[PDB]
Ligand SMILES: Nc1nc2c(ncn2[C@@H]2O[C@H](COP(=O)(O)OP(=O)(O)O)[C@@H](O)[C@H]2O)c(=O)[nH]1
């Protein structure tokens with residue numbers, strides 16, 4: 726029953742809730758509350774759905790609920806360690822990874838998304854993602870990725886796998902793909918049936934979800950936990966000085 730917790734984050738209507746169901750299988754109502762969804766694979770996989778952010782005209786301090794949630798899991802874990810009675814196995818409800826959905830605009834990162842990602846990246850591992858990447862043509866995807874990569878660097882946003890931490894060669898493959906071009910679907914024939922052809926979501930030539938999935942739960946899954954435990958949680962623990 727080894728545990729791994731992922732949280733999806735972004736504005737509403739970006740296919741965030743759809744990708745959650747897509748990930749597990751490997752109309753949905755507008756998400757109004759933070760909801761934790763858990764199924765078993767042996768791994769206990771938890772995907773955390775969240776209300777949209779940046780939906781309002783004014784969005785100051787609108788990152789606080791998600792920020793509260795992330796910090797609440799660190800706090801539960803810390804209090805477990807301080808407990809004198811605890812515990813054969815401390816339950817890990819901490820957010821290990823965080824998929825941040827980026828609107829497939831074509832231009833550049835929005836100050837809104839930059840502001841949010843820059844805050845999240847300090848307390849959790851961020852993996853940027855192009856929402857509804859089927860929107861983009863092949864040439865648009867490449868150009869937009871360049872702008873996102875340039876913007877991430879120029880705004881000092883640490884995405885997983887973080888640079889400061891053979892392994893370097895392996896990690897570049899992950900970094901060259903950020904932001905991941907993902908497509909959501911829960912129908913199978915599994916793809917998204919459009920007017921002109923069906924998009925095969927787990928087909929590497931159609932989108933990049935297949936890569937992200939294997940990179941998140943198979944090859945990097947332990948390292949994401951390790952960074953969560955040794956960097957983010959340890960930094961939280963220190964702050965309680
Ligand atoms: N074009 C496209 N549409 C999608 C994709 N994933 C979901 N959608 C559609 O986007 C709409 C809202 O999706 P939803 O999962 O509720 O987004 P969320 O509210 O941000 O979680 C739905 O009508 C979906 O059918 C995708 O990969 N590509």
Ligand SMILES: [Mg+2]
Nearest residue numbers: 741742755756
């Ligand atoms: Mg939703």
